[PDB]
Amino acid sequence: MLIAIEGVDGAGKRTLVEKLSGAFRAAGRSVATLAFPRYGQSVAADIAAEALHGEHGDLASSVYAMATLFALDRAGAVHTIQGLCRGYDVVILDRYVASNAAYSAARLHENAAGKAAAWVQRIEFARLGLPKPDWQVLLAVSAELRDAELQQRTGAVYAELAAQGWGGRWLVVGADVDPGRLAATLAP
Amino acid sequence: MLIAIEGVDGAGKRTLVEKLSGAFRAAGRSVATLAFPRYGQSVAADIAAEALHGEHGDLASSVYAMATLFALDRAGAVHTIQGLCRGYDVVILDRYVASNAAYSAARLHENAAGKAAAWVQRIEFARLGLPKPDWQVLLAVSRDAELQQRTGAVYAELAAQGWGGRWLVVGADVDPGRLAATLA
Ligand SMILES: Cc1cn(C2CCN(Cc3cc(Oc4cccc(Cl)c4)c4ccccc4n3)CC2)c(=O)[nH]c1=O
Ligand SMILES: Cc1cn(C2CCN(Cc3cc(Oc4cccc(Cl)c4)c4ccccc4n3)CC2)c(=O)[nH]c1=O
Ligand SMILES: [Cl-]
Numbered sequence: 250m251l252i253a254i255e256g257v258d259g260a261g262k263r264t265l266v267e268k269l270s271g272a273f274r275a276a277g278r279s280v281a282t283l284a285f286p287r288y289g290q291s292v293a294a295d296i297a298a299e300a301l302h303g304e305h306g307d308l309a310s311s312v313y314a315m316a317t318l319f320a321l322d323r324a325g326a327v328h329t330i331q332g333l334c335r336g337y338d339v340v341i342l343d344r345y346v347a348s349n350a351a352y353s354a355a356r357l358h359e360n361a362a363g364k365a366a367a368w369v370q371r372i373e374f375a376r377l378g379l380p381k382p383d384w385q386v387l388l389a390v391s392a393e394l395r396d397a398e399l400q401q402r403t404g405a406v407y408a409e410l411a412a413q414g415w416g417g418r419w420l421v422v423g424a425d426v427d428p429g430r431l432a433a434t435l436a437p
Numbered sequence: 438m439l440i441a442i443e444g445v446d447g448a449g450k451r452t453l454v455e456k457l458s459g460a461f462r463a464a465g466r467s468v469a470t471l472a473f474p475r476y477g478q479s480v481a482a483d484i485a486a487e488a489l490h491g492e493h494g495d496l497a498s499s500v501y502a503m504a505t506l507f508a509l510d511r512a513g514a515v516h517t518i519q520g521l522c523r524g525y526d527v528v529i530l531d532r533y534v535a536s537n538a539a540y541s542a543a544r545l546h547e548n549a550a551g552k553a554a555a556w557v558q559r560i561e562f563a564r565l566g567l568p569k570p571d572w573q574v575l576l577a578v579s580r581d582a583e584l585q586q587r588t589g590a591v592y593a594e595l596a597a598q599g600w601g602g603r604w605l606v607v608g609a610d611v612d613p614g615r616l617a618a619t620l621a
């Protein structure tokens with residue numbers, strides 16, 4: 250089973266991943282985790298990070314150019330993801346394809362029903378063949394939570410993506426989620 | 438030996454590659470050829486081509502975003518290039534790294550000594566590890582018409598600077614047998 254944990258930076262995804270992993274293991278389920286972007290492991294991810302810090306000329310000014318680098322980062326991990334899914338009962342990804350839909354739409358002042366969100370789904374799931382997650386868990390935070398307005402808009406798109414079932418089933422949870430009850434909901 | 442053929446669209450690079458290959462083969466040396474971008478074989482190349490036709494949102498509006506895709510296209514061919522260079526006497530590339538310097542600078546309205554050109558050399562040769570060509574042949578002949586003119590001038594500037602290695606500047610009626618003899 251493939252589970253994606255989603256949310257804006259600072260939401261607390263990492264702690265939720267650890268909480269859910271322990272809950273899964275406590276129930277007898279093996280767990281592996283993988284975090285995107287793979288900074289320090291993917292040239293596409295590293296070029297993106299560097300672009301965000303003002304390097305590589307005007308690269309960061311293109312929303313779709315940045316989204317493509319993150320998509321290419323995941324496309325190189327597809328064999329890794331499949332291997333984990335074959336060896337572990339649950340695979341939890343800290344950020345996945347929906348991250349591209351949320352930030353790309355937010356950067357372009359669009360909503361989950363907009364072009365950018367639909368473009369991400371087409372290119373990552375349809376063309377590049379990335380496995381669709383069985384679950385996408387949105388760790389939701391408020392508007393008050395670098396660029397503060399971008400994170401707020403990204404948060405709103407996230408909720409819309411979840412409400413629309415973008416790419417599969419979603420769960421909307423808060424920070425202090427009940428780990429045993431959540432693992433039971435995800436893996437019955 | 439690694440040879441790159443450079444020039445603006447319509448210069449006749451494809452024809453020169455074919456003529457030069459036969460000259461090399463006629464001289465008893467094996468030849469393989471590879472054309473960039475690898476449209477239809479690289480996701481980065483296809484996304485770039487599609488971006489140039491108005492798809493993929495704002496991707497084409499970024500000079501460095503386009504250059505990065507062409508660099509990533511070549512970066513995915515780096516082992517392919519190395520394999521061919523180890524198996525054939527001559528490897529001729531239709532377009533290579535210098536294309537990124539020329540079109541990026543020309544789009545930047547900057548000369549070969551500008552930032553983009555130095556950025557292309559840095560990211561493709563140093564960082565991405567693309568092999569430096571033994572020869573870069575500029576087919577010097579002259580759809581945004583003003584963009585192509587600037588790209589041609591930057592091309593000649595790159596050749597004058599020895600950008601990335603030795604260059605040869607040739608015209609339309611170049612003698613392929615004499616050119617193959619000069620290269621090897
Ligand atoms: C996995 C993924 C992630 N993201 C975003 C990319 C932006 N970060 C935030 C971020 C991340 C940044 O760079 C970082 C942040 C932390 C560590 C490193 Cl090494 C680099 C930024 C740097 C400068 C300015 C703003 C920055 N903002 C959140 C996930 C996408 O847009 N699409 C994706 O597919
Ligand atoms: C290999 C390489 C190539 N180029 C350029 C990219 C642009 N083309 C010209 C071109 C190429 C285009 O797209 C094509 C053209 C022909 C075939 C395909 Cl599949 C796509 C264009 C489409 C619309 C409008 C203008 C277009 N211009 C010349 C090589 C670089 O800038 N850097 C590179 O590294
Ligand atoms: Cl977080």
Ligand SMILES: [Cl-]
Nearest residue numbers: 447448449450
């Ligand atoms: Cl040509």
